[PDB]
C-alpha cells in the first residue's frame, strides 16, 4: 500500500521554507526506498515527482527523571514535484 509508505508531512521552519520551491517534506516508512516514495506520493497527491531526496535520522536520547531512552529513528523524504505538476497543500 502507499499510505503505509507515507506516514505524515513534516511541518518545521525549514520544511515550510521550501513549500514555495515545490519541495514537500514527509516522514516515510523506515524500510521505504525513494522509488517506493516517488510512486506513493504520485498515488496519493496526483502530482508528477521530479526527484526524491531521503535521509535517515537516528533516534535522539531523552531522559525523563532516572528513565532514559531513545526517540524513534525517522526516514524523512523531500519530494520535488515538476514545474508543470499541481501543488500539495499542507
Partner RNA sequence: GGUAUGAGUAGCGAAAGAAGGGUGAGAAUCCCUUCCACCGAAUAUCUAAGGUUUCCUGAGGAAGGCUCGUCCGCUCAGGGUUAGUCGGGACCUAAGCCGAGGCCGAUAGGCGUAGGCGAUGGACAACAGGUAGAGAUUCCUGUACCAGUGCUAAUUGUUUAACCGAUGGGGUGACACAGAAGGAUAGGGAAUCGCACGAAUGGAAAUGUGCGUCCAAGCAGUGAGUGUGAGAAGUAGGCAAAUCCGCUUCUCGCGAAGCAUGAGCUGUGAUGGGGAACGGAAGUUCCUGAUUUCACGCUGUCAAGAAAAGCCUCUAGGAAGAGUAGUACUGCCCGUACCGCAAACCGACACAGGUAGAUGAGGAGAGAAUCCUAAGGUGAGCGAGAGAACUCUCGUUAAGGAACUCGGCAAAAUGACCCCGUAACUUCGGGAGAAGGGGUGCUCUAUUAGGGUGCAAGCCCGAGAGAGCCGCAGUGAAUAGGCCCAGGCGACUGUUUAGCAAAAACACAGGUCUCUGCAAAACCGUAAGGUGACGUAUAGGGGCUGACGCCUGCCCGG
Residue 7 binds RNA (CB under 7 A): no
Q: How far is the CB of 13 from RNA (least distance, A)?
A: 4
CA 73 to chain centroid, in Å, comes to: 13
Q: Which of residues 34-63 bind RNA (CB under 7 A)?
A: 34-35, 38, 50-51, 53-58, 60-63
CA 71 to chain centroid, in Å, comes to: 17
Pick from 2, 9, 44, 80: which binds RNA (CB under 7 A)?
Answer: 80
86: which residues sit within 8 A by CB, 6+ positions away? Answer: 45, 46, 47
Find, among 48, 47, 42, 59, the residue nearest to 5 by Cα.
42
Site pattern 15..34 for RNA (x: CB under 7 A): x-----x-x-x-------xx
Residue 89 binds RNA (CB under 7 A): no
Amino acid at each position: 500500500d502507499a499510505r503505509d509508505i507515507i506516514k505524515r508531512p513534516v511541518v518545521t521552519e525549514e520544511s515550510t521554507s521550501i513549500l514555495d520551491d515545490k519541495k514537500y517534506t514527509f516522514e516515510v516508512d523506515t524500510r521505504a526506498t525513494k522509488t517506493q516514495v516517488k510512486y506513493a506520493v504520485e498515488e496519493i497527491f496526483d502530482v508528477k515527482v521530479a526527484k526524491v531526496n531521503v535521509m535517515n535520522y537516528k533516534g535522539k536520547l531523552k531522559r525523563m527523571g532516572r528513565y532514559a531512552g531513545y526517540t524513534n529513528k525517522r526516514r524523512k523524504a523531500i519530494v520535488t514535484v515538476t514545474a508543470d505538476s499541481k501543488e500539495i497543500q499542507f
